Amino acid sequence: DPAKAAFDSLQASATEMIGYAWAMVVVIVGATIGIKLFKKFTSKAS
Amino acid sequence: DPAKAAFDSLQASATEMIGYAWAMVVVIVGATIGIKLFKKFTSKAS
Numbered sequence: 001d002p003a004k005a006a007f008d009s010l011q012a013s014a015t016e017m018i019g020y021a022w023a024m025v026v027v028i029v030g031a032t033i034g035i036k037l038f039k040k041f042t043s044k045a046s
Numbered sequence: 047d048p049a050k051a052a053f054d055s056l057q058a059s060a061t062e063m064i065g066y067a068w069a070m071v072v073v074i075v076g077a078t079i080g081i082k083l084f085k086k087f088t089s090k091a092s
Contacts, residue, residue, distance in 0.1 A: 003084055
């Protein structure tokens with residue numbers, strides 16, 4: 001009874017945090033791959 | 047015996063009292079174990 005409510009609130013907080021994490025990852029990985037492709041295509045085009 | 051009546055009343059009181067004590071212990075122990083398990087499972091799940 002008091003414990004069910006507690007667990008429910010914890011799960012909700014964790015769901016929001018996973019949401020923020022996905023947002024950050026996208027921006028960092030975007031940059032990394034961007035730079036990689038730039039270096040690659042510039043050199044092949046000569 | 048002058049004392050026979052006295053002993054019977056003691057017997058009766060003791061029976062009732064044992065009854066009350068069992069009720070209290072259940073409630074206290076319920077709480078204690080409840081809190082313990084909450085702390086344990088929350089941390090393992092995280």
